[PDB]
């Protein structure tokens, strides 16, 4: 009889990150906490969200059950739930999901977890560069590149982490030596991506949070955010745009 209670900002962060690529994903209530991973219909990006049980103001499961949650209606209802308005999720039945907050109890029906596209096996990626920086400084690097182009270049070496965008009349570069990055392993990496997705990922995160970036050469990029003050871990994996010769 799932009976969880999280803060409003917590539910609003995950539902947004998820529904940011899907409209219905399977949510996994495990012993270690809440899990849920999905790829967009396009098959370009992947999101993996984790909420260990210590982020909830209570997390009561009576067996690890998976539920098919209609992410759109959930996200849509979430725009009511307040930031401080504790929300309690309950699934004491098999057909519906009760969402309680304030004097409102919303009840949306559940989906057959196996009725939704089966999620993607979490990749086993081995990437050269590992950059740890602030999500805000990052979100500002993406916002800037969006005015110059549809794509950007993540360039890593020993002299720091670089993100570059070029237009036919201008260019922009976001550089942070290892000395200004929270962490940096200095590995050499270089992959190009579409600002479109990168800008969409940046929505579920703001300044003040941290971000680890796993970059390789002509490989996808892993964007692991510590959201809601380290209470929610949202990872976005974007496929690269390969330089066609």
């Amino acid at each position: 009889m799932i009976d969880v209670i999280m803060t409003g900002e917590l539910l609003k962060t995950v539902t947004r990150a998820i529904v940011a690529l899907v409209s219905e994903a399977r949510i996994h209530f495990l012993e270690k906490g809440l899990h849920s991973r999905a790829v967009d219909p396009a098959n370009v990006a992947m999101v993996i969200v984790d909420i260990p049980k210590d982020s909830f103001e209570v997390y009561n499961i009576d067996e690890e059950k998976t539920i098919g949650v209609d992410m759109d209606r959930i996200f849509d209802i979430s725009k009511s739930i307040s930031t401080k308005d504790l929300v309690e999720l309950i699934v004491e039945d098999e057909s519906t999901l009760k969402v309680k907050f304030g004097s409102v109890e919303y009840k949306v029906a559940l989906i057959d977890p196996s009725a939704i596209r089966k999620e993607p096996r979490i990749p086993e990626l081995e990437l050269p560069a590992k950059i740890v920086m602030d999500a805000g400084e990052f979100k500002k690097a993406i916002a800037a590149a969006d005015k110059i182009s549809d794509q950007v270049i993540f360039r890593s070496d020993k002299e720091g982490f670089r993100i570059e965008a070029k237009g036919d009349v201008d260019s922009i570069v976001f550089h942070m030596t290892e000395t200004e990055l929270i962490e940096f392993n200095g590995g050499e990496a270089r992959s190009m991506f579409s600002v479109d997705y990168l800008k969409e990922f940046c929505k579920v995160a703001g300044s003040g949070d941290l971000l680890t970036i796993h970059l390789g050469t002509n490989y996808p990029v892993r964007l692991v955010f510590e959201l809601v003050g380290g209470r929610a871990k949202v990872e976005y994996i974007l496929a690269p745009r390969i330089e066609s010769e």
Partner: peptide, 11 residues
């Protein structure tokens, strides 16, 4: 030029 790839190649 550049071609957006898919995640299927890496999974």
């Amino acid at each position: 030029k550049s071609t957006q790839a898919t995640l299927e190649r890496w999974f």
